[PDB]
Amino acid sequence: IDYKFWYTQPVPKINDEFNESVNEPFISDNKVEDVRKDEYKLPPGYSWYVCDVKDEKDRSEIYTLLTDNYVEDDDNIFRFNYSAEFLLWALTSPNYLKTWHIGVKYDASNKLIGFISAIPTDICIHKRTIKMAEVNFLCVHKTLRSKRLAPVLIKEITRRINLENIWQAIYTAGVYLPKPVSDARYYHRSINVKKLIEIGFSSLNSRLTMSRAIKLYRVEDTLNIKNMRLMKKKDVEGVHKLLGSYLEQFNLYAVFTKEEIAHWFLPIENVIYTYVNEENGKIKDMISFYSLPSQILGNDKYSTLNAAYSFYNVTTTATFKQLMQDAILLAKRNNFDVFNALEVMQNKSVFEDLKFGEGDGSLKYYLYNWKCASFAPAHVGIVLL
């Protein structure tokens, strides 16, 4: 459309296409010393608030704000319902800064009505490793929409990030913005198909009756990789090598340290599920998925859809199809209703045979202050929360 805000920022124009050899900032030679030391102005009666995600009550305020005002699907059937414990995990990874968890309070109610967050990460884009901020959980209260508050939150966080001598960022959104480096459709594999029909999501007909739909999505309760088990602290070094080598093939991926592997994969109930196959004290295969429920808006019977989201999956002893079939099984054993995956990495190759259905949209991958050729989602090797 016009992108009056986005076009002031070091991002590509809607028309911009770069050749494969281009891989650099839009604006280089930035100076920490020149970064504005003042907070961006909020409109009258609003104030910046530094959230302490480790404090249960500050964390619960962020939780409420998102439970009520965060992303909905295009038909407003669903709203993401990230749990408080999930938010603690997503925001307190290694070297996180408390000052990159930025809230906005309405002074007179003392209530949180705005939020944005970033955590630091090393990102490899087209074989160049860049220290970046990963931005996530940008949210304005439904009652305050289209008032140009989002660019204030975006400018304030960019300012705080630049204070740490960091000048690039990664982010994802379902909305089209200038301009994606990659665009990945999502797919869904029904697990609790009766529930899915009942809330309006899945479709039946003459050929596909209720009983036939249930038969179609039945899984055998036996693993292809018999020894696949929950990840444990002893597996951190093994996972780090398995995953770190795997990821090198891609055009876009995080370069995880050991401390990151421990944070991002060690299992937490209702948050992150990681499974490993150990042979001879070596980790040869791994499955992971995170738990992201959606709230079901205005269904009499159900209020929550429990959804497992494919995270990182690597196999060296089975086919990728057998690995993902095990991942679906492990999601089913843990009470999930549906398993969601993007057409990143090798994922697309299994979607047909494993009975995934194509969804109604896509997740776009973005870089801030970085010029490079865009690429097909098969070359994307990072999954953001």
Ligand X SMILES: CCCCCCCCCCCCCC(=O)CSCCNC(=O)CCNC(=O)[C@H](O)C(C)(C)COP(=O)(O)OP(=O)(O)OC[C@H]1O[C@@H](n2cnc3c(N)ncnc32)[C@H](O)[C@@H]1OP(=O)(O)O
Ligand Y SMILES: Cc1cc(F)ccc1-c1ccc2[nH]nc(CN(C)C)c2c1
186 binds ligand Y (CB under 6 A): yes
Smallest separation, CB 194 to ligand 9KZ (Å):
13
Pairwise CA distance, residues 97 & 93, whole Å: 9
Nearest to 224 by CA among 285, 164, 279, 307: 285
Binding site for ligand 9KZ (CB under 6 A): 71-73, 78, 80, 188, 201, 294, 305, 307, 338, 340, 359
Binding partner of 123, given Mg ion, ligand Y, ligand 9KZ, none, CB within 5-8 angstroms per partner class: none
Is the Cβ–Cβ distance between 167 and 25 less than 8 Å? yes
Smallest separation, CB 369 to ligand X (Å):
6
Instruction: Establish whether 138 is an annotated binding residue.
Output: yes
Instruction: Establish whether 273 is an annotated binding residue.
Output: no
Residue 310, strand partner residues:
289
Residue-level length of the chain:
385
Binding mask 121-150 for Mg ion (x = CB under 5 A): -------------------x------x-x-
- Please identify, using beta-carbon distances, which residue of 45 and 200 lies nearer to ligand 9KZ: 200
Instruction: Establish whether 140 is an annotated binding residue.
Output: yes
How many binding residues for Mg ion (CB under 5 A)?
3
Range in contact with ligand Y (rule: CB under 6 A) among 34-42, 144-152, 167-175, 276-284: 167-175
Pairwise CA distance, residues 283 & 316, whole Å: 10
Smallest separation, CB 53 to ligand 9KZ (Å):
22
Binding site for ligand X (CB under 6 A): 3-6, 69-71, 133, 135-140, 145-151, 154, 157-158, 161-162, 166-169, 171-173, 175, 177, 368-369
| Phi, psi (degrees; rounded to nearest 5) at 117 | -145, 155
Pairwise CA distance, residues 382 & 385, whole Å: 10
Binding mask 146-185 for Mg ion (x = CB under 5 A): -x-x------------------------------------
> How far is residue 24 from each of residues 28, 119, 364, measured CA to CA in Å?
8, 22, 20
Smallest separation, CB 149 to ligand X (Å):
4
Binding partner of 36, given Mg ion, ligand 9KZ, ligand X, none, CB within 5-8 angstroms per partner class: none
Tokens 């080598």 identify what position?
Answer: 245
Pairwise CA distance, residues 351 & 321, whole Å: 9
Binding partner of 305, given ligand Y, ligand 9KZ, ligand X, none, CB within 5-8 angstroms per partner class: ligand 9KZ
Binding partner of 135, given ligand Y, ligand X, ligand 9KZ, none, CB within 5-8 angstroms per partner class: ligand X
Binding partner of 177, given Mg ion, ligand 9KZ, ligand X, none, CB within 5-8 angstroms per partner class: ligand X
Q: Which residues bind ligand Y (CB under 6 A)?
A: 71, 136, 172-174, 186, 309, 340-342, 363, 384-385
Binding site residues for tetradecanoyl-CoA, as ranges? 3, 5-6, 70, 137-138, 140, 146, 148-150
Binding site residues, as ranges? 3, 5-6, 70, 137-138, 140, 144, 146, 148-150, 300
Binding site residues for Mg(2+), as ranges? 144, 300
